[PDB]
Design a protein around this ligand. Sequence first.
Ligand code: B12
Ligand code: NA
Ligand code: NA
Ligand SMILES: [O-]
Length: 343
Amino acid sequence: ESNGDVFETGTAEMYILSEGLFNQNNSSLARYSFNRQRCTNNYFSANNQRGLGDTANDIAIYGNKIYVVVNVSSTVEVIDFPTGKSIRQISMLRDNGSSRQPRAIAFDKDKAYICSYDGTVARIDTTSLEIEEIVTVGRNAEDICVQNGKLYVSNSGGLDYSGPGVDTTVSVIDITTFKETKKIEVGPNPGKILPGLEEAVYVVTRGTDIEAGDYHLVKIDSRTDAVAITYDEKVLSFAIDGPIAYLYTYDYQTKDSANKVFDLNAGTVIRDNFITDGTAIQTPFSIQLNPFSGNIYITEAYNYTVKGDVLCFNQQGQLQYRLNDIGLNPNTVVFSDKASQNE
Ligand code: B12
Ligand code: NA
Ligand code: NA
Ligand SMILES: [O-]
């Protein structure tokens, strides 16, 4: 079930979200307690006697609640952090009752913001857990983050590729008014979006035909709401640590991949292979930092039909530990420096 000493500094627990497979209704949530050295592979269903659903796509801890965005079940599952017990299942539906298909969540003050493939952002109150307001953005909204009092939302248009084609913009929402103020042109099929230093926002663009590998990283200046830099590096997903990005790209035709350390100030590669100890990853499926230790966490999805792994590296590219067979297509790892009250 693991290799290496399962250890983290400054961290009580980790949560690993697994999306399962599209239309197979088999998402799952694992919890690892560093404090108790205990892994629970089915943390949501063990405590709630039902499954998370189909294509669980994002997870975050905010305040003292865990939020899981479940894309195809079209819900936001809100969970009490101390107990692991469901507080509310928030159905995300269009005015006609159809699925919005939510994707990602971000937070500011006492509000949560969920973007959805129907082209909307919903504001939820973190106390009442009611949906308060809906605003339209661009097409097939994919990811969302907060910077400088504003929301930034990638309008992928990914589901539209065969119709009008993919979309090409990041929507900007003023949080105070909750109104869309601008659509910034960034390039085709925007995806993962993250805030960085000095009011920056970084977004991946995946091209008009995602399979072809026309991938870029784009930097937006949130002071002027305009593109500052377009890099040439092929980037499919990334994580930010100050002026350094830890990133990967994947070739859906050849199945080759690369995981790299990248200098965001220079636009040049620091290390062509992030991993320095020979550890092999076949299908990198997520990348993120543990904010309490600085370690790099990458998930492994294999051929998408067998359970994947979570790998923990230091910034020097040395594997600290891995947890294997954690869930089907693990896509997000989040961390708590406070222990829950659940064994
Ligand atoms: C690999 C993959 C792809 C590959 C597939 C081909 C390849 N070269 O490998 C590529 C990169 C082309 C791809 C593209 C897209 N897909 Co895709 N991707 C997947 C992934 C990771 C695994 C699919 C797989 O191999 N599965 C297991 C095999 C054994 O089962 P399968 O039924 O044979 O799988 C087939 C379908 O998944 C199909 N497929 C792949 N993507 C999509 C998307 C849609 C909308 C449909 C109808 C079918 C489809 O291709 C697979 C092989 O034929 C899943 C993850 C998941 N399932 O949770 C998503 C997932 C199915 N993909 C998704 C998305 C969003 C996309 C894109 C819109 C991405 C984008 N452009 O922004 C496009 C749309 C299709 C297109 N061709 O343009 C979403 C669909 C969610 C939704 N509500 O519609 C999922 C669930 C990912 C997620 N959200 O977590 N994808
Ligand atoms: Na579960
Ligand atoms: Na469809
Ligand atoms: O995908």
